[PDB]
Amino acid sequence: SKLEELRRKLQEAEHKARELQEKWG
Amino acid sequence: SKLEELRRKLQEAEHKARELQEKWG
Amino acid sequence: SKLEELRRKLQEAEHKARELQEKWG
Amino acid sequence: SKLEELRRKLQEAEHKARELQEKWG
Numbered sequence: 137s138k139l140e141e142l143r144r145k146l147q148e149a150e151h152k153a154r155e156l157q158e159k160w161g
Numbered sequence: 162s163k164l165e166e167l168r169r170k171l172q173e174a175e176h177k178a179r180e181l182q183e184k185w186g
Numbered sequence: 187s188k189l190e191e192l193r194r195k196l197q198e199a200e201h202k203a204r205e206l207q208e209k210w211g
Numbered sequence: 212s213k214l215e216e217l218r219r220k221l222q223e224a225e226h227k228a229r230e231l232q233e234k235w236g
Contacts, residue, residue: 138177138180138181138184139177139181139203139206139207139210140207141177142174142177142178142181142203143174143200143203143204143207145170145171145173145174145177146170146171146174146196146199146200146203146221147200148170149167149170149171149174149196149224150193150196150197150200152163152164152166152167152170153167153189153192153193153196154193155163156163156164156167156189156192156193157189157190157193159163160189161189161190164228164231164232164235165232167228168225168228168229168232171196171221171224171225171228172225174199174221175218175221175222175225178214178217178218178221179218181214182214182215182218185214186214188227188230188231188234189231191227192224192227192228192231195220195223195224195227196224198220199217199220199221199224202213202216202217202220203217205213206213206214206217209213
């Protein structure tokens with residue numbers, strides 16, 4: 137469970153990085 | 162706040178990693 | 187370029203977390 | 212070691228995100 141939660145938070149962070157790059161890359 | 166949201170999610174992931182270390186070392 | 191480097195670091199961490207979960211599964 | 216490596220990658224990504232946030236300030 138905890139590792140699954142870690143991976144979900146990390147995927148959400150990567151999605152925000154993708155969105156940052158869409159706007160500012 | 163995209164970058165702020167990214168950092169918040171990343172902190173949450175790191176906290177889950179520390180919770181795993183509390184159990185498994 | 188620093189936005190790509192940040193995204194790719196998060197992706198590297200995703201790789202490590204997936205591999206850890208594969209060993210746990 | 213593998214959990215410590217994962218936690219380290221997350222800390223490295225936070226270091227990059229903080230650096231980005233400081234430049235964007």
